[PDB]
Point group: C3
Chain length 174, copies 3
């Protein structure tokens, strides 16, 4: 049982790649060499009062950690850049999520900029019955009350279904 | 031998020290001392999210030295189940029902709070979304494009139009 | 006997001492030893990818299969002098940046807060944009729709025509 020592040793920490995802069960199968695992858990960003979900992709690289080389109970740590998921940025001053559809969410502390960028689609901020929606063709604000505090300038036309009440002058140009 | 076994341990969070940023964990019948966990970031940018009681993870201890082991959380279980099952979305879900998610099939970023508030603040400017209101506040508010209001419009100051102003 | 050195080498406490941004690699130090250029575990490397380079002085652990440290991988995120715990709440999830910016959700207060001391927040979808900066909030789109009673605390300037479906009433 001395070869078992180096066996367990070698099996404790394994470089591996995702080959299968059981989404409903939240498990992955990984491959290290010509060995394929059973259904194993991956470490997510949070699994408590807060939970995060981001299933590892097939082809994603990481490391499997198995207590005493008990590989049937190993857990997977993804996030190794590779052909299935390359480094999405190269800046010393940025924290960036990039998605397959070209979307990205990034903070840059050199430029002091938070950027939510979608080539197409919708960004939605909803709290109860209130909503800010940014889409390809519109920005919409919906609420029981819409309050604009400050000088407002409209570069365009304005159409109002209900009454318009002004506390000052109302002056046209035509 | 014993080092071998002690180097990588399956464990569950059993106590949290918020001020010290440490947790105690349990593996089998063994309970650890106060240990650090690996956060998402600990450099120029830092992230904070304390592991919860009952949160499962792994303890890594160099040369079996469990007194200095570090904890990697995030294993789904009773204290925190997988909050989604989609292959095309990335989701934060919170205990109060709030969620922040991006879906790359639908091309949608969604920030959803059942109740409460979302605040985007830059210097003195703010966009605030709450149960009863959306409010914009800034030294200058600029709307570029044709504006349509389904409702009434009340303006405290003057209304100055560059064209005609017509009622019905 | 030779297994001891290997065991010891499999899991190492370490600190970043060099960063190669272009190659996405780090050199770490443990004891008197400095690694070659090694990979770190990012938050995501699949269809979804995340980027956040470990900082010099950031502490973590190196994992090396069979003690082969030349192929070791780095797990960062151990709070230390190069980056301390940025919060202490049991009810928050928080990013805190070096310029004082923060993004945080608090589930006791039911609040999502994006806070920048200065700079810009930009939400861009196609050609539409909501932008918040020190001196302005701007909405830009082929169409801007406000659904609900709108109250303006200030003056209103409109370059184009104004059409009202009810009364238009001034003070003067
Ligand atoms: Ca032996
Ligand atoms: Cl246990
Ligand atoms: Cl790399």
């Amino acid at each position: 049982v001395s070869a078992e020592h180096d066996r367990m040793l070698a099996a404790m920490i394994l470089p591996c790649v995702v080959v299968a995802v059981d989404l409903a069960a939240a498990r992955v199968r990984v491959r290290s060499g010509d060995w394929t695992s059973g259904w194993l858990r991956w470490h997510s960003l949070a699994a408590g009062k807060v939970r995060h979900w981001r299933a590892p992709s097939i082809g994603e690289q990481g490391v499997l950690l198995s207590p005493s080389g008990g590989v049937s109970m190993g857990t997977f740590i993804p996030g190794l850049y590779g052909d299935a998921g390359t480094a999405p940025d190269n800046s010393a001053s940025s924290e960036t999520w990039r998605f397959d559809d070209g979307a990205s969410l990034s903070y840059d502390w050199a430029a002091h900029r938070y950027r939510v960028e979608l080539p197409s689609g919708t960004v939605e901020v909803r709290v109860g019955a209130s909503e800010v929606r940014v889409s390809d063709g519109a920005v919409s604000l919906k609420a029981p009350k819409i309050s604009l505090e400050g000088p407002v300038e409209i570069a365009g036309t304005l159409t109002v279904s209900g009454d318009i009440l002004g506390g000052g002058s109302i002056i046209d140009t035509a």
